Design a protein around this ligand. Sequence first.
Ligand SMILES: O=C(O)Cc1cccc(O)c1
Ligand SMILES: O=C(O)Cc1cccc(O)c1
Ligand SMILES: O=C(O)Cc1cccc(O)c1
Ligand SMILES: O=C(O)Cc1cccc(O)c1
Ligand SMILES: [Fe+3]
Ligand SMILES: [Fe+3]
Ligand SMILES: [Fe+3]
Lengths: 233, 233, 233, 200, 200, 200, 200
Amino acid sequence: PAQDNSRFVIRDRNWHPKALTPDYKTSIARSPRQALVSIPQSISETTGPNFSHLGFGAHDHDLLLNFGLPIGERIIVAGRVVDQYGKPVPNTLVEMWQANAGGRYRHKNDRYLAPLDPNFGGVGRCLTDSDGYYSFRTIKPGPYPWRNGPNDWRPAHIHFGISGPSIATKLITQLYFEGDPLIPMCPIVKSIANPEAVQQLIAKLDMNNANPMDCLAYRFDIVLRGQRKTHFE
Amino acid sequence: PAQDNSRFVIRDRNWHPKALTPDYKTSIARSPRQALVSIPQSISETTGPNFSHLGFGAHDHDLLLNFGLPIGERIIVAGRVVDQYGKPVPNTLVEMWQANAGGRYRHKNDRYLAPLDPNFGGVGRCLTDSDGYYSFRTIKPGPYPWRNGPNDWRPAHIHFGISGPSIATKLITQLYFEGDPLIPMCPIVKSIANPEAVQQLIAKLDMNNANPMDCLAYRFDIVLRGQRKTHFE
Amino acid sequence: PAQDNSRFVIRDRNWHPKALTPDYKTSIARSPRQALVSIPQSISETTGPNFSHLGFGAHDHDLLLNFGLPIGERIIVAGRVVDQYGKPVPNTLVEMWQANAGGRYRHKNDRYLAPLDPNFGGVGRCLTDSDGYYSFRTIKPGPYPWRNGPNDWRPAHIHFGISGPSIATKLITQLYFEGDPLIPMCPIVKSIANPEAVQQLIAKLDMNNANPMDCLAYRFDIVLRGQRKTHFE
Amino acid sequence: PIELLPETPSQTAGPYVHIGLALEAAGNPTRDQEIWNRLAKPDAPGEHILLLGQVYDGNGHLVRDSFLEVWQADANGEYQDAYNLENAFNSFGRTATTFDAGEWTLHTVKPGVVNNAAGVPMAPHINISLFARGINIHLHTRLYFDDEAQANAKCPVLNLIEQPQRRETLIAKRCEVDGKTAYRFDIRIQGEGETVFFDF
Amino acid sequence: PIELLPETPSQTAGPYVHIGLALEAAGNPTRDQEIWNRLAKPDAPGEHILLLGQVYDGNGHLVRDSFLEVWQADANGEYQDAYNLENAFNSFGRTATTFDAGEWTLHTVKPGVVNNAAGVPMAPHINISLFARGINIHLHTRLYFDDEAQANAKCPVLNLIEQPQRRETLIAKRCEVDGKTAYRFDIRIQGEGETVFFDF
Amino acid sequence: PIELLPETPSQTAGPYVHIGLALEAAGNPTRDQEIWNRLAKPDAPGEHILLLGQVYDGNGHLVRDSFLEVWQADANGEYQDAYNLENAFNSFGRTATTFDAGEWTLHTVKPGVVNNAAGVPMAPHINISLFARGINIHLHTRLYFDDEAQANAKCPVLNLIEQPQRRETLIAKRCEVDGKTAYRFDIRIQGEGETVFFDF
Amino acid sequence: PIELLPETPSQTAGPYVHIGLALEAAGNPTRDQEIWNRLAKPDAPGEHILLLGQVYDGNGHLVRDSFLEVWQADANGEYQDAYNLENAFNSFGRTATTFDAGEWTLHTVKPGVVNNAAGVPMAPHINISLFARGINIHLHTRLYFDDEAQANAKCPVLNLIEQPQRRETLIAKRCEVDGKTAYRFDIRIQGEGETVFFDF
Ligand SMILES: O=C(O)Cc1cccc(O)c1
Ligand SMILES: O=C(O)Cc1cccc(O)c1
Ligand SMILES: O=C(O)Cc1cccc(O)c1
Ligand SMILES: O=C(O)Cc1cccc(O)c1
Ligand SMILES: [Fe+3]
Ligand SMILES: [Fe+3]
Ligand SMILES: [Fe+3]
């Protein structure tokens, strides 16, 4: 079984978005009013599932094939998962979901008028390698309107879920694309107070990783809470 | 009895910390939701106690003797109490309390693992002189952890209580020490919005007032609301 | 036995403090007047003791336990020992000594008026690990007065002795604490002519290595002379 | 405009205020002379009364670490600023809430009427300042008495409170404790029936 | 001071989280292996139970697009980190609320006891993480059982909650669903009876 | 040009160096294993000798707070780096000057001959490092033996010293203590007869 | 840290100091009242003595342009601060060295004993301040008497001088001039037997 041998660097709650961010409407009624209660790390918090033995399919990470070819910008999304100390996070679970090229999601609740793509599902997962690298093949998602303010539009984004070594490190985030003029206008992106934090969410155009006459590529590295050994406890 | 002959400059509530400062957890439930009601100054508010005749003990202000010698950095904490007009506040009551060298308080509720000091109490009182000066002799307190965020530490600080000429001027504050790296991370310090306000709470090393081969000295001046005569009322 | 297989980068004697630094009075009569005679490195100079087999006690590096609990600020002092090439120095001897919370040393010749601490000795030793890491558990020492100028005060400091791979690399120094206002006033600190050099001596507050509700942590990395292979000799 | 020196910023008294201002409660030895909760000696002119209350947070929970300061006129409606333990009556006092029960008590006399700046009489009241951990800057309030309805109706201060329903938060309820005249004054810091707090 | 690399900032999962983490719920075809709400196979040691709940917003309305992740020890108080569908018991699971009823379900066993870092035993509990549109950063909580009063009263964690009334928010109510042992754990994100959420 | 990371700047050992590196001398209890002044056990091969000396300041006053470190080859001219109290001989040792007499002493054997990098033999010598309050960066020197004049005259290291008279400063004078072969090595930090100090 | 206004910087008195502070010596007409070398009138209580000495530079050469200021208690160990030409005794005086001989003289009485701040008695002494061309900031010293060995041994000030040999530089050698009790005190600014100089 799992063992309590690590401590995780305390989260910076001023770095992450706060709970109540009024411009993002839904947050109003979905944020606690009482302060969070801080508790010491224990085995309960310092352990988590290892996905090494999950049976992944051959195209789990390839959205071009896992659902003809989808219509849209062929791109490779790749990067590395590291901790705050800069150490790689091997064999960790990376899950992603997104809309199609027109901004339509393949979900019951999506009623946006842009049509669904018959050859596109929008889900991928990849277990990181020994060096903490992951990669996905997909199409660049389109932006999409949402009922917030009267003319709100989500910048093109891919949703990410990363397990890490513990439930303490588990994270859900969104990737944005370098240069997207919608970025600075998004109430959700704006949930983040530090502009420096925002930059961390922006995937960079990676010509070196592109496949000539085939597809472009974006680089997106993820940083998880720093893991350290207990001392004088 | 006391006479309603004065007016006190209105308090700047954007200068002082606000009631609701979410990062300071306990403030959430202990801050009023309704606006304060402004009321004109009356004799009720412009008068207050005069402690000239309180029977002060000989070492009331000497934390080194008033409880063997305590363990810690022997320092003198001295300054002046003036009003916003720069007028000295003579014969006013200055009370202080603080932890020991390790950050332990001599109070039932203090369960911090740093030991008590057999020769240290941590309470002092001084009546300012004719020129508004006060002084205390103590040891420099140690920082201490507290259940706010998972890894919060108060900077080393001395608690202060100043009476002034009326209940309108009475104030409770905390003195911090010059150069303490914990200052900028404290949620209580950060209850204050203006960094310039923060500077006012920092005691400066005062080599000039030190007793060579004996103890160092810190300078801390306090400014109470300006007192003016009533006019055309 | 040891073998002459290494060369050590020559010391920068303008980086290190000079011999004669008149503000530090005792250096006047304890500094050579003739120039040092430079000599090439031989087996004599490129070798040194290996302390891997010294029998260290279980609390050799825990000043809280190696002498009741001492009174003072509980801290961890940790860091890494590397050479100028940035290579780790594994299994090397790190020794330290300091005063108690009040600036009092447990030594016959220390007559400072601050009391000794019954549970505190002030000596530690630690062998670096495979990655060049060391750690000590202790309490933050206090500054203390000394007979130099009429009102000189050493900033809080911990003395350090580092063996390294040879007698050529053996070094003695002092660690100072981030933000200490005394630092700039110290004649000993000022024996170093380059401000950049002084910065190398300052330990930094390390919240990431602290034990919540227990003790703080300071980080202090040490750089020994670069070690290279001989070539075309 | 003209700008004076800025006032030193307030900070919470914190959880350990008792060590500095309520020694007895901090459970520490006291000094020869302490400022406490007995404003009037038995031989003091006026109606001797007992004041008591609890302090509640926005959750409706007892604030067991509160520290309170009071200022009031004597029975003649005079403010006695010369603090002396010898005095039969002192205008200033201090009290705090039990770490257990969470109730403070005060031993005094019913204050006499005092006029405002404009010469209009204010109903008998006691000025209160509340301090505690979680409180960045202390809260100012006033305690009025329920047996002074006639006076209360005409208080220029009480009349400044826009909503009549809020004025009630300031009225202490007269009772008896061991056959002694007592008034109960509960303070609700936030939420339902939140007590009015003043700025002056 | 020392600063490390900053952690990547969190963002809300949004309303479509299901397509990525709850395929069936999104109403899309699943893959061979999926992480779902059945932590234990019938042949798993321990007392088999059914967990069910509803999620409420600050207006008292059901949160029908919620996504939850659970972490628990096995019946022997052991954490089984090697996730595998072949296992008779998995320490990790996933669940979501019906867009209809707004109720989530989980099939597991009552966890055994585990000690904290200082060697003190913690009451049997389940670690929960909640995600949803409107939630910028996921919320941490614990589910405790009402039939473990004794252990509960001694939990080093439950005891960190200052107000006892607050602790009750983490206690699941033992019931029966089709004459099967169940526990109901409703979560109130905001307001009256708001559930305690942790930071660690 | 190319610059590497700067070496950590040296600082004086200070007056209390003893507490850290000469426990006995600080007059504090010692640990199980200490690095002291006895490099050779009675059963170590070679000629057993006693080394002693005094240290003088620029005023010709005794330096009573000095701390010394020694590095030498065994009788076979070999450097023994694996430090161990069990060893018959250790190449590394420590000593200090009496707060009173201000004389240090070391118990060792006369070192064998070692070759310099060019393969040329060096006269028998002991590598010394001097530390004390008033010394910002430690002083390096060598101890040669007066009874090795032949070897000395050919020393590639001794020969780098321009003035012959300065060379003499490095030669310990053979004596006898309790009919034990002893060599006296006085160090004069400054002025008349100032000892040669090296840079390497 | 707090910084005060900086003290006005010192500058050497220069070669012509005499015209301003030793008129007779400059060889200029004096004024009605001058501050000079006769601290005591014949009728002053205490042992009347003659003080004389020479000043030497680092080359062992006489400094013939020196200016000295003296401060000492009276025979009762009392400081007489109200300077008056009428007083039988004045605690302050001035002298200078002949451009010829290079010797200064003072006419006083043996000072009484005074206590340091700690209440410890200091040996009888005369505080001296020396000025001259080549001296940027004046030098401070103390003159002690050879015939007070007992007292000298216990002086908390003399005892502050680390090396005993250095203490001797402060002792005046008693002699007799014209059968008058005299003490010779020579100052060596620099080099061999350099006089101790203080900072306070
Ligand atoms: O609430 C706390 O424990 C921290 C704290 C806050 C302010 C002053 C103190 O003495 C202590
Ligand atoms: O609430 C919404 O419709 C907009 C939205 C917000 C965040 C992530 C998404 O996928 C979609
Ligand atoms: O000489 C001194 O007394 C002052 C001092 C100087 C350097 C290190 C120390 O421990 C102490
Ligand atoms: O030595 C000098 O002649 C020059 C000098 C120096 C200083 C003051 C003076 O009056 C004259
Ligand atoms: Fe989306
Ligand atoms: Fe405090
Ligand atoms: Fe020191």
